[PDB]
Amino acid sequence: FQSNAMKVAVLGAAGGIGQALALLLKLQLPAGTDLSLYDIAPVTPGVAVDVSHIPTAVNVKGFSGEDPTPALEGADVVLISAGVARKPGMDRSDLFNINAGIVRGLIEKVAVTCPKACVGIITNPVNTTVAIAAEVLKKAGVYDKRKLFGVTTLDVLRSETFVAELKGLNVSRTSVPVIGGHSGVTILPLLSQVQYAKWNEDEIEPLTKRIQNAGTEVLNAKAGGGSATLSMAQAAARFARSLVKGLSGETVVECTYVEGDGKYARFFSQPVRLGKEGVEEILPIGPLSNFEQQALENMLPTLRADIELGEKFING
Amino acid sequence: NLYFQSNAMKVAVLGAAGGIGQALALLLKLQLPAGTDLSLYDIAPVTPGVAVDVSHIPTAVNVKGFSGEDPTPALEGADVVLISAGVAPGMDRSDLFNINAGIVRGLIEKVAVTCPKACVGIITNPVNTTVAIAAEVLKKAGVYDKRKLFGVTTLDVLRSETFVAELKGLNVSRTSVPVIGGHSGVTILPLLSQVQYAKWNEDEIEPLTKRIQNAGTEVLNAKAGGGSATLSMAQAAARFARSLVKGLSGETVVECTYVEGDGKYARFFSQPVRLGKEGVEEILPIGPLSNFEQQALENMLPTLRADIELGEKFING
């Protein structure tokens, strides 16, 4: 069952993101929480042993091989960070090319073993991989709209970080709502809703563009070889932390990609109140500036098409 | 001069591209106090991008990355220098050493010139030896300060805290276990007899002490030849860096660490050390030992002295 000692499962724990996430979870999760780390690579048991030497009351266990079932049994939260992250040769293309199958394979296991878990899709491209997860869950007859999330949190860290620097605000207490999708023109930070910031029309377009293209700053600084591994892990840990709090009865609100009312797109990221069933209430986006309003209408076709790509991968 | 006194604390990580380094830069971005500057350096060209990666995390810690053959920009004004460069599967201990000993020498040569008054924490293995190496390089430049050179043994401490807490039902985040001696094999000596609230049967001592001493190998084997401990090692380093930053900032802390002390047992030896504004403020005594610990200490010295000798020879002769 669920809801006694909280149980968190990480599928993709051997990758760059996964290992970093495992570390943060060991240090951040509540005492008593069970942490199951899974990946195909035989190194995974060793990753868990490595993390288990850190003195926190989080119980960590390792799993490898073809079947993630032992790691998923009784899972409350399932974080999927398997597959590849962007790199030099990889465009929107290569991520979907490799990660579409991986996601499907893992979600099929989740649908059988722990269908009532809150599922956090970190693996990119999120706009599409979430639709893949949904369709797989629907085929198995266990899809719960309240428990499937596209982890868009890295766009929030980035927006908070760049906004605080530019406007001289407290970097750790500056809330910036971000809506839409988790890629390119689909990422829309709502700068007009940020408190204590007076915006010249001049700085709106460049800041938005910097938030949207932030991954490229890393990709170019890393001289190609590497993506945003460390910030992605922190974004995932922060989201996981919010999920666990919602499940534990503590109200938290996070902007995340979920199947909402479909006003703009079947799946869409917006403020969500998290609770005991995962989503408790999908909140409105609130008032938008002319700029933000236009950016929203302009992303719709791209966002819808990203979703249709994931749907068609499962439904043909 | 009674009022306000600012503080532009700076921490540099040499070897920020490896497994340990990247995890360490993440933890330091998250754990260092607001306003601290974090400099990352490694010959690997990816380093500047590692820094851009962590710079997207919303904390008031400014981070910059540097690559190339010159770590100078990374060391300028540094208060704390953590050296995790070099290599950790499928290699003889003598095969690595020659590679790592050289890299440590090269980096300490720059430290001596650019930031000689910085506290230097050596993570790169074998620590028993690499520390002697750094000490001799600093001495050649006439800047070796005993109070500012440390062998980071903190991981033996985390392991000791964790194994003891779990075996004896104690609070894992509130269990203190002193670890003395060195950072490798028989030289790692956890003082189990000084652990509060733990009743030991004589037969539990040997296997638990061996578990702590052989923890590295257990991770090495468990990773199926995919590497050594990296994640727990980054956290050990983060904790030691956090302690150095506290001491320098005027906050008294005590950490078991490998330093040049009274030389009662060996030139360099790990023991409790009160940290302060000059690095080492006072090197405290090991305290009372059980018969087992006293024997383990005596049986271990020849190996520890030889590890030190090797590091001195690498530089002097």
Cβ of A230 and B53 within 8 Å?
yes
Give yes or no for A46 touching B (CB within 8 A). Answer: yes
CA distances from B306 to A16, A168, B267 (A): 38, 55, 11
Scan residues 200-219 of B and list those with Cβ closer than 8 Å to A: 215, 218-219
| Whether the Cβ atoms of residue B138 and residue B245 lie closer than 8 Å to each other | no
**Can you tell me the distance from the alpha carbon of B218 to that of B229, in angstroms, rounded to the nearest whole number?**
9
When computed from its CA atoms, the radius of gyration of chain B, rounded to whole angstroms, is 19
Instruction: Write down the experimental method used for this entry.
Output: X-ray
CB < 8 Å to A160, chain B:
58
Q: Which two tokens stand for residue B124?
A: 């790169």
The SS3 of residue B175 is coil
The SS3 of residue B209 is helix
Of A250, A254, A226, the residue nearest A151 (C-alpha): A254
Of B73, B68, B81, the residue nearest B108 (C-alpha): B81
Sign of the CA dihedral with B159 first, then B164, B166, and B170 last: negative
The SS3 of residue A35 is strand
Q: Which two tokens stand for residue A17?
A: 């993101």
Scan residues 147-166 of B and list those with Cβ closer than 8 Å to A: 155, 158-159, 161-162, 165
The SS3 of residue B119 is strand
Q: According to the annotation, is A94 in a ligand binding site?
A: no
Of B50, B173, B82, the residue nearest A31 (C-alpha): B173
Q: According to the annotation, is A121 in a ligand binding site?
A: no
Give yes or no for A231 touching B (CB within 8 A). Answer: yes
Give backbone dihedrals phi and psi of A118, rounded to 5 degrees, phi first. -85, 120
**Domains of chain A with CATH codes:** 1-151 (3.40.50.720), 152-316 (3.90.110.10)
CB < 8 Å to A230, chain B:
22, 25-26, 29, 50, 53-54, 57
Scan residues 55-74 of B and list those with Cβ closer than 8 Å to A: 55-60, 65, 67
Q: Name B115's Cβ contacts closer than 8 Å, sequence gap at least 6.
A: B12, B75, B76, B77, B78, B81
